[PDB]
Amino acid sequence: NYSSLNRAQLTFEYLHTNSTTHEFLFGALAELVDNARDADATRIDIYAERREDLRGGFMLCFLDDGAGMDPSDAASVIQFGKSAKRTPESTQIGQYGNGLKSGSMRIGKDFILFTKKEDTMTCLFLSRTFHEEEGIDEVIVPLPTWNARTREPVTDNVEKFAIETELIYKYSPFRTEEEVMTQFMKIPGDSGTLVIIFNLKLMDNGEPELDIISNPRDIQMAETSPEGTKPERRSFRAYAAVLYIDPRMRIFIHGHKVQTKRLSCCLYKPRMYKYTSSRFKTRAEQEVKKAEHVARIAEEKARRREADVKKRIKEAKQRALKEPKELNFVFGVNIEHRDLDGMFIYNCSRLIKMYEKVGPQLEGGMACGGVVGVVDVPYLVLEPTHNKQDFADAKEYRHLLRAMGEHLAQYWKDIAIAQRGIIKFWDEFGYLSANWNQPPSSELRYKRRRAMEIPTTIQCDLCLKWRTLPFQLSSYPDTWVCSMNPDPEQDRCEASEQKQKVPLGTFR
Amino acid sequence: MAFTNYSSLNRAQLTFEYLHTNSTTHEFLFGALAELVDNARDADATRIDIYAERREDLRGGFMLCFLDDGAGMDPSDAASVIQFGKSAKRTPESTQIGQYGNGLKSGSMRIGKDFILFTKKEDTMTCLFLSRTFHEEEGIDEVIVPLPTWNARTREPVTDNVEKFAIETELIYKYSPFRTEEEVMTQFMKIPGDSGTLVIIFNLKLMDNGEPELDIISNPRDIQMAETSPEGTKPERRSFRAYAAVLYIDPRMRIFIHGHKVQTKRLSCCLYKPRMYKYTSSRFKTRAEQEVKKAEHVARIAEEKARARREADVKKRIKEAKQRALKEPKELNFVFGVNIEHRDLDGMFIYNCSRLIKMYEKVGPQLEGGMACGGVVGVVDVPYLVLEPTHNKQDFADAKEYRHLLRAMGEHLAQYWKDIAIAQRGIIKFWDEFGYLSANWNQPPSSELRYKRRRAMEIPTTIQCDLCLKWRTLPFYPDTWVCSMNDRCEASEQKQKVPLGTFR
Numbered sequence A: 001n002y003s004s005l006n007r008a009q010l011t012f013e014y015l016h017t018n019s020t021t022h023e024f025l026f027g028a029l030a031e032l033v034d035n036a037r038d039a040d041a042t043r044i045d046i047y048a049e050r051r052e053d054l055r056g057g058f059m060l061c062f063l064d065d066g067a068g069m070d071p072s073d074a075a076s077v078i079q080f081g082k083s084a085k086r087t088p089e090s091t092q093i094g095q096y097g098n099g100l101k102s103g104s105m106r107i108g109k110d111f112i113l114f115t116k117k118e119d120t121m122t123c124l125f126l127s128r129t130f131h132e133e134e135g136i137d138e139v140i141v142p143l144p145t146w147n148a149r150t151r152e153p154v155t156d157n158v159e160k161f162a163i164e165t166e167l168i169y170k171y172s173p174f175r176t177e178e179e180v181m182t183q184f185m186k187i188p189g190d191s192g193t194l195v196i197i198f199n200l201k202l203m204d205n206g207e208p209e210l211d212i213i214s215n216p217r218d219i220q221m222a223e224t225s226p227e228g229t230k231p232e233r234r235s236f237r238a239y240a241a242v243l244y245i246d247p248r249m250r251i252f253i254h255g256h257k258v259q260t261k262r263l264s265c266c267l268y269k270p271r272m273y274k275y276t277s278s279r280f281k282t283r284a285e286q287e288v289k290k291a292e293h294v295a296r297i298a299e300e301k302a303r304r305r306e307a308d309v310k311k312r313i314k315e316a317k318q319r320a321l322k323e324p325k326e327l328n329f330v331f332g333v334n335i336e337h338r339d340l341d342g343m344f345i346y347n348c349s350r351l352i353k354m355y356e357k358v359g360p361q362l363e364g365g366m367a368c369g370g371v372v373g374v375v376d377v378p379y380l381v382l383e384p385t386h387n388k389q390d391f392a393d394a395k396e397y398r399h400l401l402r403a404m405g406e407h408l409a410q411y412w413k414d415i416a417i418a419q420r421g422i423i424k425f426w427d428e429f430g431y432l433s434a435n436w437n438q439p440p441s442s443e444l445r446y447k448r449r450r451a452m453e454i455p456t457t458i459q460c461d462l463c464l465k466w467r468t469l470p471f472q473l474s475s476y477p478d479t480w481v482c483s484m485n486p487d488p489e490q491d492r493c494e495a496s497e498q499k500q501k502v503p504l505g506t507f508r
Numbered sequence B: 001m002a003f004t005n006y007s008s009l010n011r012a013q014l015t016f017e018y019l020h021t022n023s024t025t026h027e028f029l030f031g032a033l034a035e036l037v038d039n040a041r042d043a044d045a046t047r048i049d050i051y052a053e054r055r056e057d058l059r060g061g062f063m064l065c066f067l068d069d070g071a072g073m074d075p076s077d078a079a080s081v082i083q084f085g086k087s088a089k090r091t092p093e094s095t096q097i098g099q100y101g102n103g104l105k106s107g108s109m110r111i112g113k114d115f116i117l118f119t120k121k122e123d124t125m126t127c128l129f130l131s132r133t134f135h136e137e138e139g140i141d142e143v144i145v146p147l148p149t150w151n152a153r154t155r156e157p158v159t160d161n162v163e164k165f166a167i168e169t170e171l172i173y174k175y176s177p178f179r180t181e182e183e184v185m186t187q188f189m190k191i192p193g194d195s196g197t198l199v200i201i202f203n204l205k206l207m208d209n210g211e212p213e214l215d216i217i218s219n220p221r222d223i224q225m226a227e228t229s230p231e232g233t234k235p236e237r238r239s240f241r242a243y244a245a246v247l248y249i250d251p252r253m254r255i256f257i258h259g260h261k262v263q264t265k266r267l268s269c270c271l272y273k274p275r276m277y278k279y280t281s282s283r284f285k286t287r288a289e290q291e292v293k294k295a296e297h298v299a300r301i302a303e304e305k306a307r308a309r310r311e312a313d314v315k316k317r318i319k320e321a322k323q324r325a326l327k328e329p330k331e332l333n334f335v336f337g338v339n340i341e342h343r344d345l346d347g348m349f350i351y352n353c354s355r356l357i358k359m360y361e362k363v364g365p366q367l368e369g370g371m372a373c374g375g376v377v378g379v380v381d382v383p384y385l386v387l388e389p390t391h392n393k394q395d396f397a398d399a400k401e402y403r404h405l406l407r408a409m410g411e412h413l414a415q416y417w418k419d420i421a422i423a424q425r426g427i428i429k430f431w432d433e434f435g436y437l438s439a440n441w442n443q444p445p446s447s448e449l450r451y452k453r454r455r456a457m458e459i460p461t462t463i464q465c466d467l468c469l470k471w472r473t474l475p476f477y478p479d480t481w482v483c484s485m486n487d488r489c490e491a492s493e494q495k496q497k498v499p500l501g502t503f504r
Ligand SMILES: Nc1ncnc2c1ncn2[C@@H]1O[C@H](COP(=O)(O)OP(=O)(O)NP(=O)(O)O)[C@@H](O)[C@H]1O
Pocket: A031, A032, A034, A035, A036, A038, A039, A062, A064, A066, A067, A068, A069, A073, A074, A076, A077, A078, A082, A083, A084, A085, A093, A094, A095, A096, A097, A098, A099, A100, A101, A115, A192, A193, A194, A195
């Protein structure tokens, strides 16, 4: 028994250190939103309440309507590394068990959670202000929980509970149970989660690190975003918009829907290439071997259904000796924004690499300028970094970027817009200036032309079924639902999805 | 802490899956190596020998070993290398690399699956066995880091819990390259002095084809990446020989890769026209004032509590030092310099308290495609008041302040570029006279005698001693050298003077 041996233990300065992985602050926010997706949320509202008594002048909230957490899955949040999402297929962004703790501490000193599921509403209050003011060396994470209906406590150790709630009412924006329950009641359904991040990182000037004052319908960099700063890194509304390859969920920043995007739908000629990346034909076999030998490990530890689950993964991975033997590179040219380009690498539906230039994009020029990648990389091909803004296995990752370079050139010469004239193509979509970062002209003809080539896709508000409208309203223009959809078959709420047909290209 | 008994309260805990996640911060594998050798420098190391043996019984066929002669660790400082975040190197007027208490545990696990430490200090011989093969084979969820320690002289166990020691050594002999006490002791005695650190990283992750992740066989004197050599690929990201060479701003350290000294180079004063631009970043006086306002203030807060008293004297000693932080550290030490030995190995070598945190991070004009400031290896000991590293210690945490600092060095990189007036005096002609006769920016400089000697004149030919390790600049052998070959051991440390630069 390995009970007396020393264990690695977190410390206060490790919270700072782990947050330091997030040089990308909207990446830090994006991790908390990823967890909301992994709870199968349909909405994730990201309003920021205005409390000036705290540092930063406000609180950064993440409301959602998903499958939240039970107290066990709440305690699994502070178990660094632990991700219960580990399971067959199951996009489930969380694999590393460290994105929320990584991000909420890059975002501000403190953070308070208000998850909810079934008949439980767990709170997860981790505050570095408490730690600094009381001299904490470890990582003390208050974990109080109440009942979803009665809003009465659900926890074994009452003294622990009292300490947790006392710290919440001592450092949190919410100085009593009444305001904490108000925050809980913001969760409209019987399951969901509200993550607030408070005592926010003050910039060198004194303002918080996140602006909610310049645009009250958005969370932006309080740093003056210098020109080249992309919306996704200067607006978490943009990041949440493009945060997933298949967002079956809506984002309400400041009570205002983000027009979320699959990023495969909203592109010009979204051609999908079934490529074995050269290596992934080898890492299809090793993927079969990985699922086989680890199912053998699953059998060894079992020596039962967990091995059977992993054995069915192995035969499902021997089926992935065809199906995920090749990565789905959904290349497409972003005509809405030319400069917001580069392979949007989705490691199982989470944007890890945004604006990563590969292939002809690495060398300067119009070669593959504009092309968005939208690859749904599984966690078998490759895994992200600690910050989930780079990729861990840099060897296999450079190999995947090289493979996407070959097939990005393939997509480039298959659509052949450069042969027809890349500059003329861009002129056809509003861009008639020299600077590559110049947004498209608001000119009517170019707006219509962009709206046409883009399959005008829009989620619903009840069933969330992505349709292909002849028009656009919204859902910051007016809202929309399937029932008001003017289309003969795609009008019923229960009508089958019309998930985008992808014209597949061929190499060589 | 307890105060109101937070012991009951849920503490955040690390897991085996977090060992992988932590290693994933190191997408950069020689960055993972650099973390261990940084800790060696934090030991005040004279030598760090980095030898890669041949062990076919293990995964990868070899073990990556990190021998040094520094101050090593004691049992307490060893247990501190698994207190994630804990870093006793956190001090004012910092010269160490340690802030984040996580470079060994982040890097040994990126490097390879498992890893075993050995280290020496005073009369202790401590081991930090942390093997992930162990966790994978016996189904361990929590990070379990075996901690055996021996006496440096008697080779006798020194540990409170003897059954714990037995389990630690048993795991070492189960998964480590070294079975039985004798082979572990043989590894210990490689530490030549009475203090040092031998970290071995073994059972490597393997490149997908089955080779180890670190090729030592292509060059038996080096640890190369088990990966090809693209045209665009730095030797520092292709060879830890090169990385450990350029890893420190003040390398009072020789580095012996495969028992062969690396020519560690002060990028402060090993280039053409080094210039010390003392710039306040347009922020640093404010950031230093903010830190002087903060650290002095929080010093009172901790001193108020200890006014218990060790922290109060420490905080008072910090606070007075933080009053001197208002004067001496007001302008960032930007040591700009044009690297003539390798022009393609350029961009600001962003050091940070004597550790290369952001290697090859092009700023300013270098971010813009062209020859503007191409070759200028900017070198700045960014103190721990201005900026702090990232989790991987390959970026910087505060991205706003980092971008502002890079914009500041872009401004003063343009300033340095015009002051030397190298582009004015035909940057193409400059590179032509210093070896490079190709439009290819990667193409290494020509090896003709005239051009090599011409590069030798500009570079002060600097070589480190092997006895007192006093840097010397012998008048104009190349791998072994001592002070009495120039001009003597007792000579004072003569640091190459740098012409100070001023903006506008
Ligand atoms: N806002 C949230 N809504 C719902 N579930 C959440 C939320 N935040 C965290 N969780 C859950 O709590 C756990 C911890 O999240 P996190 O620390 O992000 O680890 P992970 O999501 O498992 N992995 P990663 O996404 O790599 O960090 C997860 O297993 C999620 O299921």
